[PDB]
Write an enzyme that holds these catalytic residues in place. Structure first.
Site, PDB file in Angstrom:
ATOM      1  N   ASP B 157     -13.783  -7.341 -67.489  1.00 50.65           N
ATOM      2  CA  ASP B 157     -14.487  -8.498 -68.057  1.00 50.65           C
ATOM      3  C   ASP B 157     -13.539  -9.656 -68.348  1.00 50.65           C
ATOM      4  O   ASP B 157     -13.676 -10.329 -69.365  1.00 50.65           O
ATOM      5  CB  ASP B 157     -15.369  -8.144 -69.293  1.00 50.65           C
ATOM      6  CG  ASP B 157     -16.453  -9.189 -69.596  1.00 50.65           C
ATOM      7  OD1 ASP B 157     -16.768 -10.007 -68.698  1.00 50.65           O
ATOM      8  OD2 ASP B 157     -16.987  -9.177 -70.713  1.00 50.65           O
ATOM      9  N   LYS B 159     -12.117 -13.207 -68.569  1.00 48.11           N
ATOM     10  CA  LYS B 159     -12.703 -14.574 -68.590  1.00 48.11           C
ATOM     11  C   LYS B 159     -12.130 -15.321 -69.745  1.00 48.11           C
ATOM     12  O   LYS B 159     -11.748 -14.683 -70.751  1.00 48.11           O
ATOM     13  CB  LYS B 159     -14.262 -14.567 -68.634  1.00 48.11           C
ATOM     14  CG  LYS B 159     -14.881 -13.712 -69.742  1.00 48.11           C
ATOM     15  CD  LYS B 159     -16.403 -13.770 -69.724  1.00 48.11           C
ATOM     16  CE  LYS B 159     -16.974 -12.890 -70.817  1.00 48.11           C
ATOM     17  NZ  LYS B 159     -18.447 -12.708 -70.678  1.00 48.11           N
ATOM     18  N   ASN B 162     -12.986 -14.376 -73.447  1.00 47.22           N
ATOM     19  CA  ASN B 162     -12.410 -13.115 -73.946  1.00 47.22           C
ATOM     20  C   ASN B 162     -10.925 -13.211 -74.336  1.00 47.22           C
ATOM     21  O   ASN B 162     -10.377 -12.278 -74.933  1.00 47.22           O
ATOM     22  CB  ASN B 162     -12.600 -12.032 -72.820  1.00 47.22           C
ATOM     23  CG  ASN B 162     -14.003 -11.491 -72.855  1.00 47.22           C
ATOM     24  OD1 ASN B 162     -14.821 -11.893 -73.688  1.00 47.22           O
ATOM     25  ND2 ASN B 162     -14.330 -10.567 -71.990  1.00 47.22           N
ATOM     26  N   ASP B 175     -11.665  -8.046 -75.912  1.00 49.52           N
ATOM     27  CA  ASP B 175     -12.928  -7.347 -75.727  1.00 49.52           C
ATOM     28  C   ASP B 175     -12.871  -6.237 -74.682  1.00 49.52           C
ATOM     29  O   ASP B 175     -12.787  -6.520 -73.489  1.00 49.52           O
ATOM     30  CB  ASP B 175     -14.026  -8.378 -75.411  1.00 49.52           C
ATOM     31  CG  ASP B 175     -15.441  -7.843 -75.434  1.00 49.52           C
ATOM     32  OD1 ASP B 175     -15.615  -6.626 -75.353  1.00 49.52           O
ATOM     33  OD2 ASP B 175     -16.357  -8.632 -75.619  1.00 49.52           O
ATOM     34  N   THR B 192     -18.987 -10.314 -65.759  1.00 50.53           N
ATOM     35  CA  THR B 192     -19.615 -11.644 -65.843  1.00 50.53           C
ATOM     36  C   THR B 192     -19.771 -12.218 -64.440  1.00 50.53           C
ATOM     37  O   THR B 192     -18.834 -12.087 -63.645  1.00 50.53           O
ATOM     38  CB  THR B 192     -18.765 -12.537 -66.748  1.00 50.53           C
ATOM     39  OG1 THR B 192     -18.639 -11.882 -68.008  1.00 50.53           O
ATOM     40  CG2 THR B 192     -19.357 -13.963 -66.891  1.00 50.53           C
TER      41      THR B 192
END
EC number: 2.7.11.11
Lengths: 18, 340
Positions: B157, B159, B162, B175, B192
């Site tokens: 994840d 991005k 985060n 996260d 995502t």
């Protein structure tokens, strides 16, 4: 421009995971 | 030898991880020991609040999960897994779990507080990062993934949303809601949309190479101010990702474009990070020629940005509606969360 296209996408804000 | 030192470091890190993974720590504080300061973020599961540890005066980011909501949203395994990883990892760019506990209604994870806020906020404020600025953050992620991948953890994840910034301007991965400890391949559709590797979208078996693809997306978005694949809806984003086409802003250096073509590579037998030389293909790339990998790890490099101050210590953060923390007189979902 690509920047204008990015703004038009409506996904400039925080993105959630699927 | 630098290479033998990396091997010895990772062997010790795996031994430390496996000990904590096998015997996780539980119930190391209580809600009555903290004062609420402000809500930092809200989601489906619950929220993150800035809190003060009353005994010490130290500030932390406390993640509060409503057990009933977690069960309703089918997030039991994800929640237990996130906590299990957090208590077992140890790397300078991974958020520390200071305490964890549960009560009748909620699960609590008391995390290290990152006062610099989200990379996302700074990136959208500034527009885009210069290539040395983007490179500094990218180097932290490379080292973080080398660490996580060595423990057979796929992150899934990555991005700007985060990646938090600490007092020293260094980034912190926070996260772990989608991270999985798996040796071979995995199949779950998660992550995502803008950051999904094509093999995820196409329902193929995938591995750690998805994180190297997401790194390409992150580098691109940091340097350009927008991601390489975007559209009005997720399904339209998926079409662009699987196409095998990418365009670069004219201001991107030739080295940056070459790195991105190797990370944003549809062909798994050609993707950087996924070859015989593994992470060294990225570390030795011309775009990283000025990067002193040991100095980044040792936190000796002056960060490109060290975080206008208004009234108080949370003046630069968005305002969320302050909602109660209700603790039911009845225990909810006891069996489901016994390992927490």
């Amino acid at each position: 421009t690509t920047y204008a296209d990015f703004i038009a996408s409506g996904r400039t804000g925080r993105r959630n995971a699927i | 030898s630098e290479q033998e030192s990396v091997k010895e470091f990772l062997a010790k890190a795996k031994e430390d991880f496996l000990k904590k993974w096998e015997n996780p720590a539980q119930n190391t504080a209580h809600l009555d020991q903290f004062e609420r300061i402000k809500t930092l973020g809200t989601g489906s599961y619950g929220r993150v609040m800035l809190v003060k540890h009353m005994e010490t005066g130290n500030h932390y980011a406390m993640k509060i999960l409503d057990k009933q909501k977690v069960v309703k949203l089918k997030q039991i395994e994800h929640t237990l897994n996130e906590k299990r990883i957090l208590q077992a990892v140890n790397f300078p760019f991974l958020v520390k779990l200071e305490f964890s506990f549960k009560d009748n209604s909620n699960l609590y994870m008391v995390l290290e507080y990152l006062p610099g806020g989200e990379m996302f906020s700074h990136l959208r404020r500034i527009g885009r990062f210069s290539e040395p600025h983007a490179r500094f953050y990218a180097a932290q992620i490379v080292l973080t993934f080398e660490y996580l991948h060595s423990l057979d953890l796929i992150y899934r994840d990555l991005k700007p949303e985060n990646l938090m910034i600490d007092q020293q301007g260094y980034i912190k991965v926070t996260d772990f809601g989608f991270a999985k400890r798996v040796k071979g391949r995995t199949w779950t559709l998660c992550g995502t949309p803008e950051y999904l590797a094509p093999e995820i979208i196409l329902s193929k078996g995938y591995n750690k190479a998805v994180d190297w693809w997401a790194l390409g997306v992150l580098i691109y978005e940091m340097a350009a101010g927008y991601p390489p694949f975007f559209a009005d809806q997720p399904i339209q984003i998926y079409e662009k990702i699987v196409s095998g086409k990418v365009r670069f802003p004219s201001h991107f250096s030739s080295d940056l474009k070459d790195l991105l073509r190797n990370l944003l590579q549809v062909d798994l037998t050609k993707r950087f990070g996924n070859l015989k030389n593994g992470v060294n293909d990225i570390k030795n790339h011309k775009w990283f020629a000025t990067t002193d990998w040991i100095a980044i790890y040792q936190r000796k490099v002056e960060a490109p940005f060290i975080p206008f101050k208004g009234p108080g210590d949370t003046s630069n953060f968005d305002d969320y509606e302050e909602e109660e923390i209700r603790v039911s007189i009845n225990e909810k979902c006891g069996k489901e969360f016994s390992e927490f």
